[PDB]
Amino acid sequence: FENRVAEKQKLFQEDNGLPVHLKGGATDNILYRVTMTLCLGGTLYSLYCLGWASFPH
Amino acid sequence: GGGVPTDEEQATGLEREVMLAARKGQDPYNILAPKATSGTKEDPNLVPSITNKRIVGCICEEDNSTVIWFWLHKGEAQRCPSCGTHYKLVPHQ
Amino acid sequence: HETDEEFDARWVTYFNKPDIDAWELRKGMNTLVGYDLVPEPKIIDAALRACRRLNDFASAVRILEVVKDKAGPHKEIYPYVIQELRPTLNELGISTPEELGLDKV
Amino acid sequence: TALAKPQMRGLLARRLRFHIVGAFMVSLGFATFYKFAVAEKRKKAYADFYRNYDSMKDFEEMRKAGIFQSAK
Amino acid sequence: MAYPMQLGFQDATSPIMEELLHFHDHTLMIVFLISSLVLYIISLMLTTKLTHTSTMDAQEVETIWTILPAIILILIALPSLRILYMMDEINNPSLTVKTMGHQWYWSYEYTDYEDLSFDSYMIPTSELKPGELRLLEVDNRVVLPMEMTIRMLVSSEDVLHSWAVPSLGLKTDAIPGRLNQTTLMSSRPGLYYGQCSEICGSNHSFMPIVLELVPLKYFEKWSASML
Amino acid sequence: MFINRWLFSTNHKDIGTLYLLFGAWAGMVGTALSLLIRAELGQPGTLLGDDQIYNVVVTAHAFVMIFFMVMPIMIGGFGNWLVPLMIGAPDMAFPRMNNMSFWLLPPSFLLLLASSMVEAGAGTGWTVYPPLAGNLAHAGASVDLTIFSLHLAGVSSILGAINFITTIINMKPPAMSQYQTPLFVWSVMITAVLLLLSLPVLAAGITMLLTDRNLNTTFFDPAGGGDPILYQHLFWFFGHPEVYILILPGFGMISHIVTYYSGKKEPFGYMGMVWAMMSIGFLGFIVWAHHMFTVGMDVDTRAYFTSATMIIAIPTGVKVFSWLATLHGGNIKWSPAMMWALGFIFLFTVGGLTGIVLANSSLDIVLHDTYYVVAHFHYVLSMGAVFAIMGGFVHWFPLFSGYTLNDTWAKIHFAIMFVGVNMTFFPQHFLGLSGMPRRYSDYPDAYTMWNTISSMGSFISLTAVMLMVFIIWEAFASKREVLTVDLTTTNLEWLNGCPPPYHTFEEPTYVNLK
Amino acid sequence: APDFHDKYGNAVLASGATFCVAVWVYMATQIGIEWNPSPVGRVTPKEWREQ
Amino acid sequence: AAKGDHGGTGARTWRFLTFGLALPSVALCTLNSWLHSGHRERPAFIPYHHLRIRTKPFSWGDGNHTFFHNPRVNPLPTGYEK
Amino acid sequence: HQTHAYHMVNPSPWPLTGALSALLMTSGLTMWFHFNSMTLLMIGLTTNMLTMYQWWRDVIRESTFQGHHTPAVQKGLRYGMILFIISEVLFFTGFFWAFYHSSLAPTPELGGCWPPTGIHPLNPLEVPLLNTSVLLASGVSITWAHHSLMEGDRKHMLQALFITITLGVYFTLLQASEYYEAPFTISDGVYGSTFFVATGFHGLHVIIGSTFLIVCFFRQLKFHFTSNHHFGFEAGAWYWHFVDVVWLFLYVSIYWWGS
Amino acid sequence: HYEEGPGKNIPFSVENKWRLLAMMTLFFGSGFAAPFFIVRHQLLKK
Amino acid sequence: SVVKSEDYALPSYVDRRDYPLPDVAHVKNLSASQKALKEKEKASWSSLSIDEKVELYRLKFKESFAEMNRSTNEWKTVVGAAMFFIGFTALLLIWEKHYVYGPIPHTFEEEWVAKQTKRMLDMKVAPIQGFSAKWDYDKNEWKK
Amino acid sequence: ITAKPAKTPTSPKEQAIGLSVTFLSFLLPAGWVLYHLDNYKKS
Amino acid sequence: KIKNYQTAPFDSRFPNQNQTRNCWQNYLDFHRCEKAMTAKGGDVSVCEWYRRVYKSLCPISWVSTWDDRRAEGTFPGKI
Ligand code: HEA
Ligand code: HEA
Ligand SMILES: CCCCC/C=C\C/C=C/C/C=C\C/C=C\CCCC(=O)O[C@H](COC(=O)CCCCCCCCCCCCCCCCC)COP(=O)(O)OCCN
Ligand SMILES: CCCCCC/C=C\CCCCCCCCCC(=O)O[C@H](COC(=O)CCCCCCCCCCCCCCC)COP(=O)(O)OC[C@@H](O)CO
Ligand SMILES: CCCCCCCCCCO[C@@H]1O[C@H](CO)[C@@H](O[C@H]2O[C@H](CO)[C@@H](O)[C@H](O)[C@H]2O)[C@H](O)[C@H]1O
Ligand code: CUA
Ligand SMILES: [O-][O-]
Ligand SMILES: [Cu+2]
Ligand SMILES: [Mg+2]
Ligand code: NA
Ligand SMILES: [Zn+2]
């Protein structure tokens, strides 16, 4: 392997105004939206599960 | 063998700025406590700033637990309201 | 530590410095009123004459106000201090807060 | 007529000195009062009750009143 | 039992409870004194126009603020611990009674000679007899001989409970798998009430304790009659 | 912009504001639960039901007030707002981890509310003793949801503790030593160390309760060789450090409030105040078993824990007398914040002294699990902790918002609250001495009067809480913007204006060493 | 210039005190609240035991 | 202890310890544990009430098998499987 | 703009996603324990690993690639890691407290003895001793890794770090085998309770520490570490030594003295 | 950057005091109301 | 006079009895006549009139010590409003008794209490101080 | 502390509205639940 | 023999509030003595003191559970 740190330092110091969690490129946006969708969708599902568990069956 | 980079080769950003400035004996990012002068009007404490004002904390006597805080403005030297030692702002950068 | 006489002589000397500036006058009075005492008339006299050298009539009246305030409920302290200061008040033309109506709420 | 020179130093410390001693005096007054009106009162009440107390006579009065499950 | 508008402890029925009353009187006076002193000093600091706002030296006065409370704590600890160990003192009991906690009632066992055991349930409010006490009466009381040192053993067969009788200075937790011991000595006959003192479910408030103290002769005949 | 600022925050001021909003909302929940308690006890008989629903309310009352009201307001709220400002720091050491400490709490609160909605709730008490909390007497998800709620709150405070200790130690000006930091900063660090050391023990205890309930372990089950008393040791080893976690930030704010409104530049006996808070924290780890005087421990152990508990009165007394010495000679400003602090000093002392009464294991036999204990800790919590929170809130509200409160309304609010809390809890001393047990939905007839008066007091406190909401509305409605603040020379947190800019101390303060 | 307290202080104090005493006296005595006072010096003991 | 090589603890010294002491010790323990391997005769089943606790069924399988159940050595509350 | 050395972090969603993941994992465990479903639990675990990956990814971006880790920022992270380990020590302390409480006072239900009647403990001189030599050897090899990195030796750093990871995996496989072979289970009273809960949480920490070392291994492969700046390795080394010491206490207390 | 100053460092609007009154009413009211409706929920189950 | 928000970093004026000489003058900008007054102040103060002396004081200071230390009638508003909300609380208690609380148990009926009182006296409840100690068993009445 | 006059003054009548609305937001929902308690207990 | 038994006397081996081991020990002692007397053709009456103490101290449900488990062969103590 060769030292490619200088290329990453240039990429993540690029003056594009992007936050660090999105500065890697389009793949960061996809991984973020996958994470947030599962979190928000799972949270809504947990609220449904609470409603079901709150009454006898 | 080698193969491990050094800070001289690979440090970047603010870390490199601190490293290179310390190698010149400079402290632009306020890592060290400044040493006081005698604090007279003729020999005031010189407070660097990038703006025209900066908050000064004055420990009037050694081992005082109370710190005296005040804004030091550009212009004529100002005195600590508790002990009267003089401070003068030196803007640059 | 230091006697009452040494303390008063320190403050008399402090206010008697001929070229005392406005900052040192305020610093002196603001520090002095923190102590558990009403300042001796000789101290106030030196402070009032410092106001004269600084061409500051208003601070001289304020100093008389804070003498009365430091006395708290002891009503007899302020008339005594004014009595002892009357020659200085007449010499310098310093009107008391009462003569100026500044004791009225 | 001139006015006499009043005490001008340490008036706050003198007020504190006077009333801290005063509070100490009142504390002793309360301790004596409390020992007499509460502590000793409880001591004598229990001592007077049991000096000539008759537990069998007490029981018989309770039994005749019908309070017991085991003693009619 | 407690009476309406009661301010302090129920009247002592045991010598140990009598010691607790006297230690509480001794301690309550100190609590009254310190709180009054603090309240007064507060008003003292707030009722003068005189001022002193410069730096105050603290070392000398903090000797007073430390030695005096330390001495006071010692005058509390000494009688407190003396009562603590006299509670624990070796005594020679003449009878051992076990109580088992249940949801939601107490069962008692007298197994020194015969196998006497029974349950003790709260008298419901609708079934109280005129003059009986709401939430306090039981169907089967704990009959005990008066003026005799009794060993009580406390346990439980389900959740935690606590067997308490304030008149006698008694409170012993009822823990399953554990046999806790306390001593009981009543100076007088009568009825002495207590209530479960550990949260134990839906009827935690409704499983009281009633001790019936009678002469030995009546206790012996009562024990025989309950075989 | 809104989502980036308030959901993705890395700013100590905004995160502190979120904690304050969260704690205020929780305070409403805890207040409603407290009224449901005293409504059940307001007259003899049963109002809601048997002890199950009652103690579910009692259990949630304690949890909401402690973990969701006091701790987020004092530590997460005032701590995040004031600590960086008081040391001239640009932010917390871990500003992004700081945001997760907050956002763990709404799910923690959700889990608590879920436990009371499913099955019959967790009617166990905030101590959650087994076997009542076990899977036999409390089958179902309620207790497990309670445990997980405590897990999330535990993680939140442990990470917050790591953040505060690191920030206070590492991010001061290079010339400022630890003995040049304000007392509130001291109180937060000591609180953070108690959190760091005590919560992991709690997390271990309740994890063992979880496995006992769901994985057939028997840590607390005698059938398998376990011991229910082991849980009590594990809980209370955290439990007492927790009550000192609840009061220590109050101690720090009281020091600042009393100093400020006495016109003083410094509190009396600074080093004595530091010594006392550190002594109180240390002693708070070796006294836990005074919550267990009736469980059947040896006399020698009961003699030690009686003695070790009482020592704590010495460092605490130093703080009380130093507060009085700070008042001595001051130009007293009778602000509403000062009134809260003056009420704190007296009422906390009363509650502290009744704690010393309970420290005596002999006397505690008759007083344990009675309302004398309830009288003890409500004086130090519902009057101590609460007044410190209210005093701090009315003192620093102009700094946080840039608007001023109506001082007359705030003094009226204090007057109503003072009457309400004392009418509520002072008669409970009588109920405790006379033998009324804790956690009862109903009581023998003899206890009627003091229960009636106590419940009437709680309604007075409700009126104060409702007035408080109006007073906050009136301040934001009128928009009286702050101009000048006194004593900025010894109160650094005010020196950047009201409110301070989003970024403060971008250029750090100048402090030389001489 | 007279502020709110100079204009309305006396009325707020008098009306507040009068309203507070009146409604608490009414609540304490007129709606059937059970205070359960001590029977000492007020209740005549009555026979309770039956056959 | 017995070794002396002090004065400079560095990469070479710690590799010396890794290959000269640490890994040989693992080899010896592996060897030792390899001679003592092999199944032992499982003991007679006694339905002790402090063992095989079942207060709530497990959340997997049939609710009666522990997570890493071994049929050879782990009996059920009713005894060993077959 | 700033003239201090501290790090102002970009606004980040990972605190929220991490907190929501904790909600999903805890409500998932409740769903699993009581309502016979693992769905919520799997979503929580997945979001938890996505949060941890992207969070620590950003920390590497902020430090290696953007240079925000000044000596002052490093010192703060040093305090953070030490304090975190301390909180982990107190967590295990509770379990050691539980163990000694049960074993020093064996109840009648156990037969009044320790080990309890019907419990046949593992031999501490067989695999438990092997596991002890494995973790002790990994402490030596990770120290060689550290000195190799400080002296600038890339090849031997990766050599020692791989050996340390292999030993960590070796311990996990041996423990997994010991779990299956054990004649006692977690349901065999307080002996099985204290044994598996304490060693199980330790085994989890071994897996966490091994993952941390693997992260440092691949970061070393990509030349992230300098000979002077490498706190990610140091934190992993501190955590690995913590894991080792906990085992030594487990071995002495539960495997040896408790046998 | 973000808005700064009074009324701008908060996640709720204070532009209109009456809209704010409704929001504070909903915010604090829902917290106070929640335990009463949870008690109602439990009583309506058994 | 006019103080602004962005002024927070500058020295400001305060009226404190323990800080009699503030950092700045109350009035900063002087009119033509006020400028001439300050020039006259450099001469003997005996030549100043009473009105001019008051004017010099009001330029340096905002309120006098008497003005800044004056008492107010705020306590009447605070105490009176506090009793109103405490009085309003009783309205909530009246509503609760009327609409929420049902009947109290039958053990509080007058006849039950009378019989319960005798039974307590028959078992000698609190005979040393608390209850039965206040009953005269010889005279069959409450002790006077 | 010194402050500016209110940028949007709240008159006594406006305060009466806010006070009434605040109290009613606390009292009405809880009052409704407590009023219908007997319906909940026996149904 | 030296009998006049009222209740179990103080035992210095078990001097604390927790009396679990006192009941457990005497239950063991009686049945260990009973087994010794039965096996070698003696009289169980020599075990009477242990019988009186454990019956005084032990809860009925403890004895009954221990009795069932001795008969079932699952008693964990050594007899
Ligand atoms: C803010 C919370 C808080 C605080 C500060 C305290 C402070 C103290 N507490 Fe309290 N306590 C609780 C919250 C708190 N407590 C809670 C919540 C419970 C019950 C939990 C439950 O069961 O649910 C409890 C229960 C509790 C018990 C158990 C009673 C029982 O359950 O049977 C005991 C007994 O030792 C106790 C003691 C003390 C002591 C000695 C102090 C001391 O720190 C107080 C020291 C202060 C002073 C002593 C006053 C100031 C000192 C002076 C003015 C000097 C002069 C004084 C003397 C010379 C004595 N507490
Ligand atoms: C901090 C903790 C705390 C607080 C504040 C309170 C507040 C109150 N508590 Fe509570 N209580 C406990 C902690 C607390 N309690 C604990 C730990 C128990 C033991 C639980 C158990 O046994 O398991 C208990 C038990 C308890 C009982 C016993 C139940 C029983 O044993 O059967 C009772 C009954 O009278 C009671 C009453 C009250 C009352 C009337 C209040 C009232 O004073 C409420 C008054 C309102 C407030 C104090 C306002 C709240 C604060 C805010 C809204 C902040 C506002 C926000 C900002 C300013 C930003 N409490
Ligand atoms: C090296 C292998 C390690 C084991 C890997 C298995 C799963 C990993 C999970 C990690 C959980 C860590 C702690 C779990 C506690 C107990 C687990 C004990 C360790 C273990 O795995 O031991 C097994 C447990 O089984 C079982 O059900 C296990 C059931 C798992 C249920 C999960 C419960 C998780 C609870 C977490 C609570 C929160 C943790 C604390 C957070 C505090 C925050 C402040 C024993 O198996 P057995 O079938 O009895 O056979 C033995 C003889 N053949
Ligand atoms: C595997 C199956 C389930 C397991 C669940 C959890 C999974 C495992 C997670 C293991 C931990 C991985 C952590 C990766 C951290 C990478 C980021 C990193 O290491 O970041 C470093 C900073 O350290 C830092 O934040 C260090 C901060 C990291 C602390 C993490 C410590 C472990 C925490 C894990 C959670 C424990 C849970 C406890 C259970 C009770 C970067 O600084 P440097 O390297 O000095 O500077 C870069 C140089 O190039 C400059 O020249
Ligand atoms: C501790 C928490 C606070 C407790 C104290 C509450 C203070 C007073 C709140 C009043 O609440 C309202 O009371 C009405 C009665 O006065 C109820 O109307 C009820 O009664 C009316 C007349 O009887 C009917 O017209 C309505 O339909 C019926 O809902 C109404 O629902 C309820 O919201
Ligand atoms: Cu049994 Cu409470
Ligand atoms: O808890 O004290
Ligand atoms: Cu405690
Ligand atoms: Mg208890
Ligand atoms: Na009730
Ligand atoms: Zn200075």
Residue numbers in the entry:
A (entry chain J): 1 to 57
B (entry chain F): 3 to 95
C (entry chain E): 5 to 109
D (entry chain I): 2 to 73
E (entry chain B): 1 to 227
F (entry chain A): 1 to 514
G (entry chain K): 6 to 56
H (entry chain G): 3 to 84
Can you list sentences taken from the study reporting this PDB entry?
HCOs are terminal respiratory enzymes present in all three domains of life: bacteria, archaea, and eukaryotes. HCOs receive electrons from the respiratory chain and reduce molecular oxygen to water. This exergonic reaction is coupled with proton pumping across the membrane, which contributes to maintaining the proton motive force that is further used for ATP production. HCOs are multi-subunit complexes, and their constitution varies among species; however, subunit I is a catalytic subunit common in all HCOs.
X-ray diffraction data with a resolution of 2.2 Å were obtained from a mtCcO crystal soaked with T113. We also determined the apo-structure of mtCcO under the same preparation conditions. The Fo(T113)–Fo(DMSO) differential map confirmed that this electron density did not originate from water or lipid molecules, and showed the highest difference. In addition, mammalian mtCcO has 10 more subunits encoded by genomic DNA. The existence of an additional helix in mammalian mtCcO makes the pockets distinct from bacterial HCOs.
